[PDB]
Amino acid sequence: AKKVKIAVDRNPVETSFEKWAKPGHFSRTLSKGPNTTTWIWNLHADAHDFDSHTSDLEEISRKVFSAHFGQLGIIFIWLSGMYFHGARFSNYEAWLSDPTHIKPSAQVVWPIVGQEILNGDVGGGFQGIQITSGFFQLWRASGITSELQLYTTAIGGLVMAAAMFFAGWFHYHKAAPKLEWFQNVESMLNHHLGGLLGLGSLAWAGHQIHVSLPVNKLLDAGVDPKEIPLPHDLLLNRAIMADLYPSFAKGIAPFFTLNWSEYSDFLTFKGGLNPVTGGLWLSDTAHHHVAIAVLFLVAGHMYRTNWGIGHSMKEILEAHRGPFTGEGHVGLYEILTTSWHAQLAINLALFGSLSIIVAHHMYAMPPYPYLATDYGTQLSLFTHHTWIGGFCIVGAGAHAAIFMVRDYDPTNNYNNLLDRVIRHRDAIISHLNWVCIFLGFHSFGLYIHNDTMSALGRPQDMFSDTAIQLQPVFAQWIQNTHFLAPQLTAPNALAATSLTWGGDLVAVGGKVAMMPISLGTSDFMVHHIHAFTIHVTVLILLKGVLFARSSRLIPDKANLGFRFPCDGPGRGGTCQVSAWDHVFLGLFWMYNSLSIVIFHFSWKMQSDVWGTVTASGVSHITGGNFAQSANTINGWLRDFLWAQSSQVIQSYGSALSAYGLIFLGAHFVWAFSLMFLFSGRGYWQELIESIVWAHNKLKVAPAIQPRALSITQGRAVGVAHYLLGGIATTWSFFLARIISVG
Amino acid sequence: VDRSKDQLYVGASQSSLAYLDGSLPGDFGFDPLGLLDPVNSGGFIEPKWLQYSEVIHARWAMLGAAGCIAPEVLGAAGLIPDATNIKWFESGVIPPAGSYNGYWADPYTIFFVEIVAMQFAELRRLQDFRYPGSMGQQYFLGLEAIFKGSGDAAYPGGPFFNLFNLGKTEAAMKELKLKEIKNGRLAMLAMLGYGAQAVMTGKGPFQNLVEHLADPVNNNILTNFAG
Amino acid sequence: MKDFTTYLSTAPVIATIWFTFTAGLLIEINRYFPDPLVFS
Amino acid sequence: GFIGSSTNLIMVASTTATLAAARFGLAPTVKKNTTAGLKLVDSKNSAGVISNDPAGFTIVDVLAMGAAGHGLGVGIVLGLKGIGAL
Numbered sequence A: 001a002k003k004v005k006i007a008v009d010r011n012p013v014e015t016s017f018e019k020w021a022k023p024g025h026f027s028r029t030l031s032k033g034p035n036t037t038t039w040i041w042n043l044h045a046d047a048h049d050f051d052s053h054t055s056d057l058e059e060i061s062r063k064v065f066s067a068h069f070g071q072l073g074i075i076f077i078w079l080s081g082m083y084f085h086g087a088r089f090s091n092y093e094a095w096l097s098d099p100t101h102i103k104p105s106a107q108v109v110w111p112i113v114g115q116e117i118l119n120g121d122v123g124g125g126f127q128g129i130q131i132t133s134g135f136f137q138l139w140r141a142s143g144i145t146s147e148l149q150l151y152t153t154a155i156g157g158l159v160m161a162a163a164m165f166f167a168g169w170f171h172y173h174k175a176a177p178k179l180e181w182f183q184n185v186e187s188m189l190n191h192h193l194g195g196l197l198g199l200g201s202l203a204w205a206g207h208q209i210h211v212s213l214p215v216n217k218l219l220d221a222g223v224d225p226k227e228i229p230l231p232h233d234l235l236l237n238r239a240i241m242a243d244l245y246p247s248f249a250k251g252i253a254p255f256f257t258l259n260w261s262e263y264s265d266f267l268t269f270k271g272g273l274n275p276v277t278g279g280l281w282l283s284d285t286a287h288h289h290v291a292i293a294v295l296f297l298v299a300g301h302m303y304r305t306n307w308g309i310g311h312s313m314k315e316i317l318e319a320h321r322g323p324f325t326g327e328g329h330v331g332l333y334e335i336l337t338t339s340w341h342a343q344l345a346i347n348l349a350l351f352g353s354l355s356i357i358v359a360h361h362m363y364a365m366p367p368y369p370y371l372a373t374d375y376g377t378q379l380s381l382f383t384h385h386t387w388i389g390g391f392c393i394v395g396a397g398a399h400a401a402i403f404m405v406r407d408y409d410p411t412n413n414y415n416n417l418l419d420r421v422i423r424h425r426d427a428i429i430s431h432l433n434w435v436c437i438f439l440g441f442h443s444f445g446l447y448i449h450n451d452t453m454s455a456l457g458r459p460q461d462m463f464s465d466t467a468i469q470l471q472p473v474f475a476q477w478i479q480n481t482h483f484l485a486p487q488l489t490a491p492n493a494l495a496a497t498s499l500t501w502g503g504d505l506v507a508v509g510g511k512v513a514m515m516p517i518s519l520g521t522s523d524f525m526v527h528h529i530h531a532f533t534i535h536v537t538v539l540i541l542l543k544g545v546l547f548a549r550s551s552r553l554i555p556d557k558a559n560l561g562f563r564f565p566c567d568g569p570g571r572g573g574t575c576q577v578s579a580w581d582h583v584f585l586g587l588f589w590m591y592n593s594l595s596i597v598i599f600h601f602s603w604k605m606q607s608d609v610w611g612t613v614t615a616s617g618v619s620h621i622t623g624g625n626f627a628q629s630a631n632t633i634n635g636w637l638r639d640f641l642w643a644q645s646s647q648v649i650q651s652y653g654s655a656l657s658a659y660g661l662i663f664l665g666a667h668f669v670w671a672f673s674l675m676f677l678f679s680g681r682g683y684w685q686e687l688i689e690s691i692v693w694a695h696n697k698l699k700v701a702p703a704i705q706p707r708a709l710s711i712t713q714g715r716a717v718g719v720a721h722y723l724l725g726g727i728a729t730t731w732s733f734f735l736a737r738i739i740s741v742g
Numbered sequence B: 001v002d003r004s005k006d007q008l009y010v011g012a013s014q015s016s017l018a019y020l021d022g023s024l025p026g027d028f029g030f031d032p033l034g035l036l037d038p039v040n041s042g043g044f045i046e047p048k049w050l051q052y053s054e055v056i057h058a059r060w061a062m063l064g065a066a067g068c069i070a071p072e073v074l075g076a077a078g079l080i081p082d083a084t085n086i087k088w089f090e091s092g093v094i095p096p097a098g099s100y101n102g103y104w105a106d107p108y109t110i111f112f113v114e115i116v117a118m119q120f121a122e123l124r125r126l127q128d129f130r131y132p133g134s135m136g137q138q139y140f141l142g143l144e145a146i147f148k149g150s151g152d153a154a155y156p157g158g159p160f161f162n163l164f165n166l167g168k169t170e171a172a173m174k175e176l177k178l179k180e181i182k183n184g185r186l187a188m189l190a191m192l193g194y195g196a197q198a199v200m201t202g203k204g205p206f207q208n209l210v211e212h213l214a215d216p217v218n219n220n221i222l223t224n225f226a227g
Numbered sequence C: 001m002k003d004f005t006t007y008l009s010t011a012p013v014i015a016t017i018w019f020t021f022t023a024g025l026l027i028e029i030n031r032y033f034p035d036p037l038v039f040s
Numbered sequence D: 001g002f003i004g005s006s007t008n009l010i011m012v013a014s015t016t017a018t019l020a021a022a023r024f025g026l027a028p029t030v031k032k033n034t035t036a037g038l039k040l041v042d043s044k045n046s047a048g049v050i051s052n053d054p055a056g057f058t059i060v061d062v063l064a065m066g067a068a069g070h071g072l073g074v075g076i077v078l079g080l081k082g083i084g085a086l
């Protein structure tokens, strides 16, 4: 058995600026220099396609490992900037005193060409752009009270950024791991589960118990931020902590004697929300992170490394075989330890799915104080993390297909699961095709039915709560079960996990933090639109993966590569047969689906959750008009788009006028993209010929011959501008709307 | 780990015995994580740096273990005034834990002298490891004659670092290197003991010993969890 | 150093420097001569 | 008086049982993995830790069964309190 050990090569690559001055050095095709403008685009498209530059897996792995330190270095610079701008260009200290009546702001524009109008009167004796990232609420939760603490974190971030960039250089040019080091998947999982996640959660729980809880307890009691003891005083003076939490008078003895009930004063199971801040109890989060730490530290001892005990991941996979699936999971261990693309396909799929879960769980169970009543931050965070998840999921389809074309090998996959999936791909795709048509007719068709009946003056014939009803009874049943959990199935929980299940609302600063969310006919219809749009996106992406190597149309698609434009006008025309083109079409459908998801979230929250609380009751921002209007297309066009676009198109002359400009700018970029999507390069190349003639006539023709974009780049440019314009349009529309009425 | 002396300690493994041949001082075959394996080694994880670093830690720890308890012992014996009878963590190294005012300058003035003094001492020592014998070449007020080293970074020797030229024979020098490393490893663990006991108890190392002897059953780590 | 100064002469780097300079010149002119609509 | 109490007895019993079970071939050890059928079988150990114990009981077994015993004991101790028995 190979011993798990450190293994590197000394000084593999000399540190020199020689190759910086030789563009295209990394590739044998491009290293000879440009002859046409296509070279310039090719230089950038191939820069990070490491496996296309060499076949040595060790060389690829080292480039991946150091590229990751580069990414981490950039993230630390980004984080350091956020903390720095919070320390130097914000109203955080003023906000801490009056969180409800002050708008977070951490960007200040210089006065030039009249742009200082963008420094709005956000409160706290401060002028600047109102941020929606939620950093103020994160900083308060961690117990930060002064600009000095923010400033010190920013310095430390730069030190970490330098360390990351040093590590990247060091581990590529000085001590580069060997291929066998990377292939210790058992050891990597043990460290990333027990160490990265387990210790990280334990350490953060340590910060929460000793810093976050004491500081936030005094803040929620009305204590002034400057009179709260500094965090190190809490650490060094057990007496101060024992005043806040009496169990601290007993030290760590209850933990070691298994008298864990003593810590019930700061390790709780309350549930619900803190009625002062509108966020989760921090004593609940601290117990959460303690429990998570134990779970992951246990998980980190599962795999065998060097001492006999533990599991062989190869032995687990090979054991799980059944009558219906041939050889089963044989060969997957080899694939997953030799293909980065296979690993990236799985990791992107779940990381993206995880991001979407974060979006849902954070709106329903707001973990930060004063997050719930900052409607601008709530809408932004949900939208942001939904989009990241969608983009990541599409990347999973792309890199699964890349594995299919480049790394898949039939000799190692005979009658196993991967081989058997390929051999009934027509059955898989044909059925998924039918499901999409069924879902399309019976979900979007219901809206078309409703629009027609309403236009004909037959409202009694519509699918609606006051007419033919479509109640989501299954979702309604689940809500009731979760609302009653504390009584029977979660006896030790004081309250339900979320107020969306049912019960009483929580109001903070005269506004609704969270309240029960009712599910009617309109909610039934929109959920089956979501089912429809997701299934089609899967169809496009899955088809690209399963037919990446061949089809009945192109029997030898694998030899044509992952990314090619077509195989000619023959066979009736074969434009966009390649797997890359399926990712291209999948992006549009991913954009179409997640647009409706966030429109669903925006309208539902404004109509039925968010609002002001007074003696007369709760008045929602749009007055509960989602239920009766959201069941027609005209309802969405009128009551959502037309009505709620009032803020953005009326923002000129105010601090929000930048959103008005971007709103129009994004419409422009979107329409600009249709030029690339609708046309073909053959037209543009012929146009460039005439323009070249004019430059020749004047002796000003370039030496690098102008060329129209390649067919594939024309598509890449088209979708990139389509997405940027479409998303940036909704971005401006959301922020101008919510920062104004929120 | 097997204390005392043994042919091999508890953690010794057949894997570690491939490269741990006993030549190095203190080689008891204890390398469960295999950090001294020469094959495919690099960076700071290599036999020369790791062995050099252990000796360096051992020597600093031996000074620290004796220095972190000496003021309390001499203060108890009355050999020094009670004003200087202070716990090692209250001397000003950690001002939040307490500081001593009465030095001829503030600790930040003293610290600058430490930086300059240690930069010279440390960077010159580094150059002898990177370029053996290089510290005996360039002029250093005539002191370069004692900075030639010996080819082994951890044991420079010479007319000063080996002032009384002890360990003249190979067998004698080998015996002394073993004694240096075993006292050093004991001191390193003692320093770790001082740090943990300070956090656990808040008292000095000498008080902890006195109280444990007074009533061993009621004074120990198990009873120090509570208060 | 020759290679590094060669790297600084590549098109993207030259474009960055030149446009940073050109933008700085235009911004600074509008800082000292604000709101120019006509030539007088 | 923690020593001799119910919690102390359970923790000592659980850790002793796991150490005893592993040492006498009643639980998996460093030199004995388990198959899919829950049957002990000679394993392949990369490190090959040395032990003078007649049965080849290494320090890793002590750590493995010590941790397993503490998990078993802690679950029982907290479990019995949950139902009120302890």
Ligand code: CLA
Residues within 6 Å of the ligand: A013, A014, A015, A016, A017, A019, A020, A026, A062, A063, A064, A066, A067, A069, A070, A165, A166, A167, A168, A169, A172, A173
């Ligand atoms: C000053 C130190 C230094 C020097 C002289 C070199 C030199 C070299 N490196 Mg090394 N390297 C360094 C630092 C250095 N490296 C660091 C810090 C890392 C960790 C990230 C690496 C990681 C690394 C890898 C993984 C590889 C090299 C390679 C190379 C060779 C080609 C470099 C090249 O073409 O760069 C020109 C490239 C650039 C200028 C791109 C810079 C990208 C960085 C991350 C900054 C991007 C930030 C930017 C803001 C991104 C957003 C842009 C947006 C705002 C528009 C060459 C021998 C390559 C090779 O072939 O080696 C044999 C190779 O594969 N290096």
Ligand code: CLA
Residues within 6 Å of the ligand: A202, A203, A205, A206, A207, A209, A210, A234, A235, A236, A237, A238, A241, A247, A248, A250, A251, A252, A255, A263, A290, B093, B191, B192, B193, B194, B195, B196, B199, B200
């Ligand atoms: C990783 C997370 C973490 C960390 C770092 C801490 C840290 C701390 N906790 Mg907390 N705690 C945590 C998680 C954590 N806790 C969790 C999850 C819980 C819930 C069960 C608690 C519950 C809890 C309670 C109830 C109490 C603490 C207390 C403490 C403090 C004293 C601990 C103690 O007695 O240590 C004992 C000894 C050690 C930890 C060993 C220290 C070893 C040192 C660093 C060695 C240094 C050696 C080196 C050679 C020195 C060189 C010196 C140089 C100048 C030369 C300490 C600040 C106590 C306190 O007073 O809080 C204010 C306290 O009453 N904690």
Ligand code: CLA
Residues within 6 Å of the ligand: A044, A045, A046, A047, A048, A049, A050, A348, A391, A392, A393, A394, A395, A396, A398, A399, A402, A562, A563, A580, A583, A720, A724
């Ligand atoms: C962890 C994430 C991750 C990683 C490490 C990679 C890595 C890789 N991908 Mg994959 N990919 C990902 C996510 C990821 N991908 C996602 C989320 C998607 C879905 C969109 C894809 C879709 C995808 C495709 C379709 C392809 C790859 C390809 C590649 C390879 C070459 C990349 C390259 O050279 O880019 C060079 C980088 C550029 C040319 C810059 C692109 C910038 C975009 C177009 C616009 C950015 C706009 C910006 C965010 C906002 C506006 C700024 C502006 C106003 C200034 C490389 C192995 C290529 C390949 O062939 O692999 C074998 C390939 O064809 N990826």
Ligand code: CLA
Residues within 6 Å of the ligand: A433, A434, A436, A437, A438, A439, A440, A441, A444, A445, A448, A536, A539, A540, A585, A588, A589
């Ligand atoms: C509004 C624009 C629009 C419409 C209506 C469609 C419609 C469709 N697309 Mg397309 N698509 C669009 C834009 C649109 N697309 C764009 C812009 C792109 C480029 C990115 C694509 C790219 C694309 C791909 C790549 C795929 C689709 C797919 C589909 C089908 C999904 C299954 C379905 O719902 O079938 C049912 C049809 C509908 C829901 C449309 C409306 C049906 C009406 C309401 C029925 C009326 C019936 C009535 C009796 C009419 C009588 C008329 C007269 C004879 C009297 C469907 C035919 C997928 C597919 O084929 O899946 C099998 C697929 O793979 N589309």
Ligand code: CLA
Residues within 6 Å of the ligand: A006, A007, A008, A163, A164, A166, A167, A170, A171, A175, A177, B041, B042, B043, B044, B045
């Ligand atoms: C993804 C992160 C990562 C990974 C997987 C590795 C992996 C590796 N590194 Mg690299 N390294 C990294 C990040 C990483 N490095 C960074 C960020 C830096 C810059 C500081 C370096 C600098 C670096 C150097 C200079 C060297 C390595 C070496 C190594 C190898 C041995 C590591 C070892 O012995 O660790 C085991 C750990 C130790 C021996 C002790 C580390 C103690 C640290 C400094 C403190 C504790 C850190 C902890 C995570 C957080 C503490 C929090 C709080 C309690 C204070 C191995 C291939 C060595 C090598 O090439 O060997 C052939 C080597 O010489 N790395």
Ligand code: CLA
Residues within 6 Å of the ligand: B063, B064, B066, B067, B068, B070, B071, B074, B080, B083, B084, B085, B086, B091, B100
């Ligand atoms: C590296 C280890 C180390 C370090 C960093 C310290 C650090 C400290 N010790 Mg500790 N100590 C150590 C080891 C160490 N000690 C050891 C091993 C012992 C046991 C012998 C002691 C015994 C000890 C005692 C008894 C006391 C300290 C004290 C101190 C503190 C004040 C130091 C001072 O005043 O120096 C003063 C400076 C010097 C001694 C060096 C003189 C420098 C001049 C410029 C040289 C002039 C040379 C010239 C040619 C004249 C030579 C004359 C000669 C031939 C007669 C300080 C926190 C004191 C304390 O805690 O006070 C509150 C204290 O009372 N230490």
Ligand SMILES: CC1=C(/C=C/C(C)=C/C=C/C(C)=C/C=C/C=C(C)/C=C/C=C(C)/C=C/C2=C(C)CCCC2(C)C)C(C)(C)CCC1
Residues within 6 Å of the ligand: A294, D015, D062, D063, D064, D065, D066, D067, D070, D071, D074
């Ligand atoms: C017979 C004999 C002997 C003896 C021995 C002994 C006496 C032993 C002991 C041993 C022991 C006595 C051990 C122990 C161990 C322990 C451990 C290793 C522990 C662990 C733990 C853990 C891991 C925990 C965890 C946790 C936490 C922390 C929290 C909560 C949760 C849990 C519980 C999970 C000798 C060798 C002398 C000689 C020969 C014969």
Ligand code: SF4
Residues within 6 Å of the ligand: A565, A566, A567, A568, A569, A570, A573, A574, A575, A576, A680, A711
């Ligand atoms: S139109 Fe373009 S993509 Fe389609 S077959 Fe012709 S050349 Fe290929």
